[PDB]
Amino acid sequence: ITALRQQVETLQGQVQRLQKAFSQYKKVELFPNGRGVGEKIFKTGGFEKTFQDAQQVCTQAGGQMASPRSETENEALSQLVTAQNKAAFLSMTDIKTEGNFTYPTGEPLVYANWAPGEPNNNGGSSGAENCVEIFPNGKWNDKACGELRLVICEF
Amino acid sequence: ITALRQQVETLQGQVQRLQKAFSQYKKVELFPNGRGVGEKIFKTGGFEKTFQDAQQVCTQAGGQMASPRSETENEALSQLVTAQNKAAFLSMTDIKTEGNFTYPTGEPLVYANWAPGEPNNNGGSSGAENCVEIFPNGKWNDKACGELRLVICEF
Amino acid sequence: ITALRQQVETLQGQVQRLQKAFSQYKKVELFPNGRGVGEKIFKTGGFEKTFQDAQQVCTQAGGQMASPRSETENEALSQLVTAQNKAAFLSMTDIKTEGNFTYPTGEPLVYANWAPGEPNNNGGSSGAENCVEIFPNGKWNDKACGELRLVICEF
Ligand SMILES: *[C@@H]1O[C@H](CO)[C@@H](O[C@@H]2O[C@H](CO)[C@@H](O[C@@H]3O[C@H](CO[C@H]4O[C@H](CO)[C@@H](O)[C@H](O)[C@@H]4O[C@@H]4O[C@H](CO)[C@@H](O)[C@H](O)[C@H]4NC(C)=O)[C@@H](O)[C@H](O[C@H]4O[C@H](CO)[C@@H](O)[C@H](O)[C@@H]4O[C@@H]4O[C@H](CO)[C@@H](O)[C@H](O)[C@H]4NC(C)=O)[C@@H]3O)[C@H](O)[C@H]2NC(C)=O)[C@H](O)[C@H]1NC(C)=O
Ligand SMILES: *[C@@H]1O[C@H](CO)[C@@H](O[C@@H]2O[C@H](CO)[C@@H](O[C@@H]3O[C@H](CO[C@H]4O[C@H](CO)[C@@H](O)[C@H](O)[C@@H]4O[C@@H]4O[C@H](CO)[C@@H](O)[C@H](O)[C@H]4NC(C)=O)[C@@H](O)[C@H](O[C@H]4O[C@H](CO)[C@@H](O)[C@H](O)[C@@H]4O[C@@H]4O[C@H](CO)[C@@H](O)[C@H](O)[C@H]4NC(C)=O)[C@@H]3O)[C@H](O)[C@H]2NC(C)=O)[C@H](O)[C@H]1NC(C)=O
Ligand SMILES: *[C@@H]1O[C@H](CO)[C@@H](O[C@@H]2O[C@H](CO)[C@@H](O[C@@H]3O[C@H](CO[C@H]4O[C@H](CO)[C@@H](O)[C@H](O)[C@@H]4O[C@@H]4O[C@H](CO)[C@@H](O)[C@H](O)[C@H]4NC(C)=O)[C@@H](O)[C@H](O[C@H]4O[C@H](CO)[C@@H](O)[C@H](O)[C@@H]4O[C@@H]4O[C@H](CO)[C@@H](O)[C@H](O)[C@H]4NC(C)=O)[C@@H]3O)[C@H](O)[C@H]2NC(C)=O)[C@H](O)[C@H]1NC(C)=O
Ligand SMILES: [Ca+2]
Ligand SMILES: [Ca+2]
Ligand SMILES: [Ca+2]
Ligand SMILES: [Ca+2]
Ligand SMILES: [Ca+2]
Ligand SMILES: [Ca+2]
């Protein structure tokens, strides 16, 4: 019928405009504290928290902590850390089994970028190191979970 | 007709993807300076202003100052204030009638969370207190409108 | 057919809600570091960079540096600069031909708002001035490109 065809065409135009406007506002949103990789979005709050508090903040916000599963994802995190000039906590811990770092689902690492000599589980006055921080250069260091580091969430 | 049915199906897929992407970017946007409650969105600019300047900033931005009409809305504001560690101005004033706080539409309060002893209209050197600040604990204190407090806007 | 008509009506409702939600999240996004003018969106990162670094940051983010082509666009930039209280770099340089400022496409200025006495190409210890900064009052001053100024990107 002629009426619905005109309706479909109008909808087609509205959808196209929504898509154009959404791509623009996606880039506006991510500037400068976010990075998109595939269907994942990394964003920093610009503040520092302990691992447990960061875990609460990310969950509360409807997301989770960053789990870099590829060089592309890790490099995206590196950019955020570099911009804030503050090392960030990742999602992974070896809390269940020492030396065995896993995602918050128990799954073993599919990607790793340990700095030379890490993980060493030597946090000095803070004690054992069961969490992971990412440096501006993208490299990882195991770090005490009670330490304060940049919060990056994953949505 | 077969042509338009295929068009509707394609539109259905585009809309579904837009909805999925929009829910994700809603949470990305609100992290960490925004809170959604029903159809209302609270967001802080991270800066402090006098009541009048805050009123101008929120209006200019296409919104208004925060009018917590329920415990849920008030608690959302509490989280933002807690995160910034800065008490924020609300929208309500008793400027027309002393002791009678109203929304910027003249409507009386449907919800209130006054701290013990408030409102007292005693601002010391600033004079009368005709505006309202919200504490990290969610409680309210009547405050001089010329004082500087965190700006939270409502959209 | 009755089935597709109901589908079109449902799509109509979904699109309308998407549009309503998108206008709200557009204003939420732009508060307080963005300004919309026509189909262009200006946003500041809140940080300072040299012209070349700012050019890299904006490009990386999927946009470009601000090219105010009208009083409306320039005034929007003025508001962002005023809010951050930091003068920002614009996109234009006279690097190809001295005294002739052009957009990063070689096109001559369609709009200009030089402060009295500018451009003068006198940056003192920094040397020649081949870039442009915008003041809180909206006026322009030619500035050395190696100086650090507020980064505003255009999307
Ligand atoms: C740290 O602690 C971690 C937590 O315990 C632990 O993680 C575990 O790591 C192992 C080894 O990598 C891993 O096993 C692999 O799992 C792969 C994914 O599929 C899972 O899950 C799906 C369902 O989601 C199942 O359908 C799969 O069968 C498999 O089930 C797992 O099976 C094992 C027993 O076989 C159970 O113990 C797990 O509980 C169970 N997991 C789940 C979630 O159910 C899978 O693709 C891998 O397959 C390889 O091994 C199979 C035999 O196990 C072969 O049949 C298959 O062909 C694969 O062979 C590999 O092929 C390569 C070439 O292509 C060779 O180079 C490899 O050598 C060869 N590997 C082997 C072992 O033969 C594999 O099963 C567990 O999933 C994981 N556990 C959890 C809970 O995630 C770590 O080991 C600890 N150490 C470190 C350093 O991280
Ligand atoms: C501070 O200063 C404020 C500004 O002046 C002032 O705000 C006023 O507060 C009163 C009392 O709460 C409030 O009156 C209530 O209004 C309710 C909302 O409906 C309004 O508006 C709609 C249109 O939008 C009309 O259709 C309604 O009729 C009503 O109109 C109002 O009517 C009054 C006169 O009756 C006028 O003076 C107002 O100008 C006018 N407002 C507008 C915008 O037009 C309404 O639901 C409430 O209804 C109750 O009272 C009615 C009689 O007035 C009853 O018929 C009805 O059944 C309700 O009875 C209540 O029922 C409860 C149980 O269910 C009982 O427990 C209650 O005891 C009982 N209440 C009463 C009073 O009987 C009611 O009308 C005004 O709307 C509001 N004015 C403005 C401008 O917003 C405050 O009083 C000042 N003090 C404080 C402490 O805040
Ligand atoms: C700084 O350095 C800059 C870089 O070299 C330089 O920028 C150049 O500025 C000139 C003068 O303003 C400008 O010329 C104008 O271009 C207008 C836009 O159209 C362009 O491009 C389109 C395609 O995109 C073509 O279709 C047009 O023909 C025109 O092509 C240009 O043509 C000139 C030669 O004519 C070439 O040198 C350019 O390379 C070429 N550009 C491109 C991209 O291809 C155009 O609308 C303007 O038209 C006016 O002049 C025409 C004759 O050239 C007339 O036919 C037409 O009627 C217009 O007349 C004007 O009318 C007004 C009243 O309505 C009068 O008041 C004006 O006096 C009258 N102007 C003139 C000159 O007669 C015009 O062509 C160049 O486009 C631009 N170059 C580049 C690369 O961008 C600056 O001059 C330097 N100085 C300063 C201070 O900025
Ligand atoms: Ca450890
Ligand atoms: Ca270590
Ligand atoms: Ca008062
Ligand atoms: Ca008080
Ligand atoms: Ca120059
Ligand atoms: Ca100058």
GROMACS .gro file of C-alpha atoms in nm, chain B residues 10-83:
model
   74
  165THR     CA    1   1.642  -0.428   0.748
  166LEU     CA    2   1.505  -0.134   0.946
  167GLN     CA    3   1.426  -0.371   1.233
  168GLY     CA    4   1.790  -0.479   1.243
  169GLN     CA    5   1.922  -0.123   1.223
  170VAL     CA    6   1.693  -0.011   1.504
  171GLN     CA    7   1.791  -0.304   1.725
  172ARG     CA    8   2.159  -0.226   1.675
  173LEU     CA    9   2.097   0.143   1.746
  174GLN     CA   10   1.919   0.048   2.069
  175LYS     CA   11   2.199  -0.185   2.177
  176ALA     CA   12   2.466   0.074   2.097
  177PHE     CA   13   2.266   0.348   2.268
  178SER     CA   14   2.228   0.159   2.597
  179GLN     CA   15   2.605   0.108   2.599
  180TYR     CA   16   2.680   0.473   2.524
  181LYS     CA   17   2.428   0.583   2.785
  182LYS     CA   18   2.630   0.404   3.054
  183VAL     CA   19   2.959   0.525   2.906
  184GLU     CA   20   2.829   0.883   2.912
  185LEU     CA   21   2.704   0.867   3.271
  186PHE     CA   22   3.034   0.728   3.396
  187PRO     CA   23   3.132   0.878   3.626
  188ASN     CA   24   2.959   1.216   3.653
  189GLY     CA   25   2.601   1.122   3.572
  190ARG     CA   26   2.312   0.927   3.721
  191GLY     CA   27   1.990   0.816   3.552
  192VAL     CA   28   1.660   0.792   3.739
  193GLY     CA   29   1.350   0.716   3.536
  194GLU     CA   30   1.335   0.963   3.249
  195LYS     CA   31   1.557   1.212   3.431
  196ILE     CA   32   1.935   1.239   3.404
  197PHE     CA   33   2.147   1.412   3.670
  198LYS     CA   34   2.495   1.529   3.573
  199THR     CA   35   2.760   1.737   3.744
  200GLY     CA   36   2.998   1.971   3.564
  201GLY     CA   37   3.258   1.922   3.836
  202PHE     CA   38   3.269   2.293   3.917
  203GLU     CA   39   3.122   2.524   4.183
  204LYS     CA   40   2.898   2.827   4.126
  205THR     CA   41   2.659   3.057   4.311
  206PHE     CA   42   2.293   2.953   4.290
  207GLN     CA   43   2.213   3.216   4.027
  208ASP     CA   44   2.511   3.125   3.809
  209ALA     CA   45   2.431   2.755   3.843
  210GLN     CA   46   2.075   2.832   3.737
  211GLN     CA   47   2.212   3.008   3.428
  212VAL     CA   48   2.454   2.725   3.346
  213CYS     CA   49   2.188   2.453   3.368
  214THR     CA   50   1.935   2.652   3.163
  215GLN     CA   51   2.197   2.738   2.901
  216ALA     CA   52   2.282   2.368   2.872
  217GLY     CA   53   1.919   2.288   2.793
  218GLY     CA   54   1.834   2.154   3.137
  219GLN     CA   55   1.762   2.279   3.488
  220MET     CA   56   1.893   2.241   3.843
  221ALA     CA   57   1.827   1.918   4.035
  222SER     CA   58   1.479   1.875   4.183
  223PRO     CA   59   1.487   1.548   4.382
  224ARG     CA   60   1.123   1.437   4.400
  225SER     CA   61   1.188   1.098   4.559
  226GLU     CA   62   1.438   0.907   4.772
  227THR     CA   63   1.571   0.744   4.455
  228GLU     CA   64   1.641   1.080   4.290
  229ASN     CA   65   1.792   1.221   4.609
  230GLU     CA   66   2.016   0.918   4.654
  231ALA     CA   67   2.139   0.960   4.296
  232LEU     CA   68   2.239   1.317   4.378
  233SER     CA   69   2.407   1.193   4.696
  234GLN     CA   70   2.631   0.967   4.488
  235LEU     CA   71   2.745   1.254   4.265
  236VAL     CA   72   2.810   1.479   4.564
  237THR     CA   73   2.997   1.196   4.735
  238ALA     CA   74   3.213   1.135   4.427
   0.00000   0.00000   0.00000
